[PDB]
Design a protein around this ligand. Structure first.
Ligand SMILES: *[C@@H]1O[C@H](CO)[C@@H](O[C@@H]2O[C@H](CO)[C@@H](O[C@H]3O[C@H](CO[C@H]4O[C@H](CO)[C@@H](O)[C@H](O[C@H]5O[C@H](CO)[C@@H](O)[C@H](O)[C@@H]5O[C@H]5O[C@H](CO)[C@@H](O)[C@H](O)[C@@H]5O)[C@@H]4O)[C@@H](O)[C@H](O[C@H]4O[C@H](CO)[C@@H](O)[C@H](O)[C@@H]4O[C@H]4O[C@H](CO)[C@@H](O)[C@H](O)[C@@H]4O)[C@@H]3O)[C@H](O)[C@H]2NC(C)=O)[C@H](O)[C@H]1NC(C)=O
Ligand SMILES: COc1cc(-c2cnc(COc3cc(Cl)c(C#N)cc3C(C)(C)C)n2C)ncn1
Ligand SMILES: [Ca+2]
Ligand SMILES: [Ca+2]
Ligand SMILES: [K+]
Ligand code: NA
Length: 804
């Protein structure tokens, strides 16, 4: 209950919120039913519209007007945005030539260039090019400032998850806004797009930019705009705040547009009806830039023009129904649409079985336009699992489709021709970034990057220290003319041991055999050189990875590969090897099929054993350095050391062997050599972070050999592919993956066929950034290169997306 009978006189769009039950006069007031009775009258004026006309020039101030054309308007800070154009012979900002902003040109009293975030809903990346003829203001920001060809959203590619990601630098799983609707099982509460529940603070985790700013003595504008406040009034409000006294004036501001999303849902992304919404957003940008120029701030303020997600063609007839797959369809609740999330209709049911629900949804029709997953089995690049609000069962929906429980859900609610929310790698979901101002570079194109990175940069733009987030601070330094952030490499926590030959063969009782008793002095020093590190410059091209936690591990050198071998997990953390364009693939000789050899540099007690694999009827083993890529018959024996072995499900060895036997050599031929680092990952609590030993839920039967949840590879070459991977003078090129270590290939509907028809497709779906692997391993890669650290940080955030 409010006492709505105070007044907004002299308080319109006040910046501090007055608490109940005073009445309120800010942007939230409508949405809380809490505005003073005179808010519309005083604060939402509309008379005479939003443009000065010649006849109003020099008019006598009439305080009823929406905006002013009177001589006193600039001093009052409330002119119409076109005042100077109509009444003082000035040019619109868009009609002015682009001129480099080498230094901030600010009025006296300005301590720092302000930041304005202009966010647009549903603004698909390709609009920049396809709508260029009708967005002159936007095209000028883009060509004259710093721009990417696209920006990658977060999954799900919905509004509130992406805008709150923009504000926090956090993945949805960490900030808590994991969909546009959410059931929390502790709140027994749903969050939706309509309703007041969304306004409760318990949903919104992390530290958004406006709080970061305020804690550090930098003042912020509203980020939230009530829907009924028209755009022209949002712009005028920002421009009025910008005229406040020095001690009262915010340094950071946001504008949000509901378009072009709103129309895109009705008409599809490139419907003829979309040209007008793009024209109207462009006009709004023009108003802000003309208002900035009037106030002499157009070469002082940093402007970010940024989208939350794109828009795809989606129609009612492209709906998959769970009613066509399940019988028990009334025992579940589905969060439907461009993603699916499934849980139990009633937590009073020990008869609910997720295993059976998954199997009834797996590879059931040939055309099937979705794929079910347990959340921990989703691609690690989505970072979509470590939250109670994300249901255990997830459906990834194909682009252009919907999922729903039953037909009536879709007709007892065709409306719509567009939607979004698909996998964040999908081209139609990509959005926009432009940065314009003294602190951004001039006429610069940068590569596509992820929206999780922008929080750090906005903090940099404002002189703030960012709260802990998921960006990689420094990875976007190349956007900026002046950086206050100079990243440095994390310190190595654990130094390796370099063991020599310390054990006799008969000390090992591993239950392993190898046919290797097949005895020259020219090649007797030569092999000693190899075990001591003589080929190490060829196989370890970027220095050894740094271990960033306390552990015990050994570096092992070999002719063909180098490894960092963990005495705690009884396997390599990493294994590094270079395959030139010229290298040959060979077979595993028949006499060496089951060969496993003790490593005389490593104790029996810190070694794996073959007996356990024999007793474990589910579990088999593979090798991290592949025997197929041995440099010589004699070097091949090094690939069968017990220190190169890793636990692998037979189903997974199909994937791994094809990767090792066919794809590495393909990449070396295409990329003119590759350097490969491979290894295990343990993420049993699916938090995206390296597990400690006491968090492992599965061991090779009867042993202390831990079972990885995933296997990684980082594949690096020269970006200038006229140079070989091992002699590259310049920038690097990388692709990486994190494959799930699964006992079946149910994820791949075509896995009964030859590996050449399904394995690469799987690996593409599980593409990853180097940074994702760093989080999952506690390792730090690329420590010794000739490149700047900033460039290396950009390389570690790169994702190879395999979209056309
Ligand atoms: C993306 O970047 C983010 C941000 O850096 C990072 O997330 C951080 O990861 C840290 C390690 O997992 C974690 O550190 C401590 O967590 C708590 C402190 O938490 C509270 O206080 C902070 C600070 O202001 C809050 O931010 C935090 O918010 C979370 O919880 C809210 C709901 O309560 C929610 O609104 C908000 O969205 C957020 O949710 C997310 O995080 C939680 C975990 O915190 C998840 O469960 C959610 O699903 C959601 O993802 C909290 O309000 C500490 O208490 C921990 O201390 C443990 O572990 C210590 C290890 O050093 C150990 O010394 C202690 O013993 C202690 O153990 C005790 O508790 C155990 C169980 O925790 C118990 O069994 C044990 O026996 C003993 O009693 C952690 O130090 C940060 O909270 C987290 N921040 C955020 C914002 O998520 C991500 O890791 C990256 N992602 C990637 C892939 O890099
Ligand atoms: C049903 O009501 C609605 C209301 C709205 C809505 C109203 N005002 C905004 C802009 O919010 C933002 C704008 C920016 Cl630029 C940033 C940042 N950084 C963050 C936000 C949030 C505060 C976190 C949402 N939105 C999304 N949108 C859909 N539906
Ligand atoms: Ca949106
Ligand atoms: Ca973990
Ligand atoms: K076995
Ligand atoms: Na299959």
């Amino acid at each position: 209950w409010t006492a709505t009978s105070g007044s907004c006189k002299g308080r319109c769009f006040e910046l501090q919120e007055v608490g109940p039950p005073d009445c309120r006069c800010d942007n939230l007031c409508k949405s809380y039913s809490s505005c003073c009775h005179d808010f519309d009258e005083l604060c939402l004026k509309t008379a005479r519209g939003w443009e000065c006309t010649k006849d109003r020039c020099g008019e006598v101030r009439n305080e009823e007007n929406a905006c002013h054309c009177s001589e006193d308007c600039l001093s009052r800070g409330d002119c119409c945005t076109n005042y100077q154009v109509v009444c003082k012979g000035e040019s619109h900002w868009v009609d002015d030539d682009c001129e480099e902003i080498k230094v901030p040109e600010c009025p006296a009293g300005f301590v720092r260039p302000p930041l304005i975030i202009f966010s647009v809903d549903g603004f698909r990346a390709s609009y920049m090019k396809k709508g260029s003829k009708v967005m002159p203001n936007i095209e000028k920001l883009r060509s004259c400032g710093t721009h990417a060809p696209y920006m990658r959203p977060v999954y799900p590619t919905k509004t509130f998850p992406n805008l709150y990601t923009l504000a926090t630098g956090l993945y949805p799983e960490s900030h808590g806004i994991v969909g546009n609707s959410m059931y929390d099982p502790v709140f027994d509460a749903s969050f939706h797009l309509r309703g007041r529940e969304k306004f409760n603070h318990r949903w919104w985790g992390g530290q958004p930019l406006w709080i970061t700013a305020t804690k550090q003595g930098v003042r912020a504008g509203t980020f939230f705009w009530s829907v009924s406040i028209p755009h022209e009034r949002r712009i005028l409000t920002i421009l009025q705040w910008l005229s406040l006294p020095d001690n009262e004036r915010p340094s950071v501001y946001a504008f949000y547009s509901e378009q072009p999303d709103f129309s895109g849902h009705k008409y599809g992304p490139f419907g003829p009806e979309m040209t007008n919404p793009l024209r109207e957003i462009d006009k709004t940008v023009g108003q802000l830039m003309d208002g900035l120029k009037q106030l002499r701030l157009h070469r002082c303020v940093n402007v970010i023009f940024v989208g939350d997600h794109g828009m795809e063609d989606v129609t009612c007839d492209r709906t998959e129904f769970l009613s066509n797959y399940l019988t028990n369809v009334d025992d579940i609740t589905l969060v439907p649409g461009t993603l699916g999330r499934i849980r139990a209709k009633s937590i009073n049911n020990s008869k609910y079985d997720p295993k059976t629900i998954i199997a009834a949804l797996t590879c059931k029709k040939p055309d099937q336009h979705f794929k079910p997953y347990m959340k921990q089995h989703l691609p690690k690049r989505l970072h979509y699992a470590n939250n109670r609000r994300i249901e255990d069962i997830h459906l990834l929906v194909d682009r252009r489709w919907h999922v729903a429980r039953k037909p009536l859900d879709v007709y007892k609610k065709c409306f719509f021709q567009g939607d979004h929310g698909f996998d964040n790698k999908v081209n139609s979901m990509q959005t926009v970034f432009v940065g314009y101002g003294p602190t951004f570079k001039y006429r610069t194109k940068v590569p596509p990057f992820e929206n999780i990175e922008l929080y750090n940069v906005m903090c940099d733009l404002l002189g703030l220290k960012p709260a802990p987030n998921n960006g990689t601070h420094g990875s976007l330094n190349h956007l900026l003319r002046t950086n206050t952030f100079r990243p440095t490499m994390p310190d190595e926590v654990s130094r390796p041991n370099y063991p020599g030959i310390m054990y006799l063969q008969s000390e090992f009782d591993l239950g392993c055999t190898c046919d290797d008793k097949v005895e020259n002095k020219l090649e007797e020093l030569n092999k000693r050189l190899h075990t001591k590190g003589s080929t190490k410059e060829r196989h370890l091209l970027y220095g050894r990875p740094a271990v960033l936690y306390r552990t015990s591990y050994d570096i092992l050198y070999h002719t063909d590969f180098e490894s960092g071998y963990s005495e705690i997990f009884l396997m390599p953390l990493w294994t590094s090897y270079t395959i030139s364009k010229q290298a040959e693939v060979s077979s595993i000789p028949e006499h060496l099929t089951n060969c496993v050899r003790p490593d005389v540099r490593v104790s029996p007690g810190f070694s794996q054993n073959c007996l356990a694999y024999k007793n474990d009827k589910q579990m088999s083993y593979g090798f991290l350095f592949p025997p197929y890529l041995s440099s010589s018959p004699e070097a091949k024996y090094d690939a069968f050391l017990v220190t190169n072995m890793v636990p692998m499900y037979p189903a997974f060895k199909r994937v791994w062997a094809y990767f090792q036997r066919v794809l590495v050599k393909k990449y070396a031929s295409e990329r003119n050599g590759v350097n490969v680092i491979s290894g295990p990952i343990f993420d049993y609590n699916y938090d995206g972070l390296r597990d400690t030993e006491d968090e492992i839920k599965q061991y090779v039967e009867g042993s202390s050999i831990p079972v990885p949840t995933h296997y990684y590879s980082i594949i690096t070459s020269c970006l200038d592919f006229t140079q070989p991977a091992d002699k590259c003078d310049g920038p690097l090129s990388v692709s990486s993956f994190i494959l799930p270590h699964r006992p079946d290939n149910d994820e791949s509907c075509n896995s009964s066929e030859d590996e050449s028809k399904w394995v690469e497709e799987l690996m593409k779906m599980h593409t990853a950034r180097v940074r994702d692997i760093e989080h999952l391993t506690g390792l730090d890669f690329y420590r010794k290169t000739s490149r700047s650290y900033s460039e290396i940080l950009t390389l570690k955030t790169y994702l190879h997306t395999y979209e056309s």
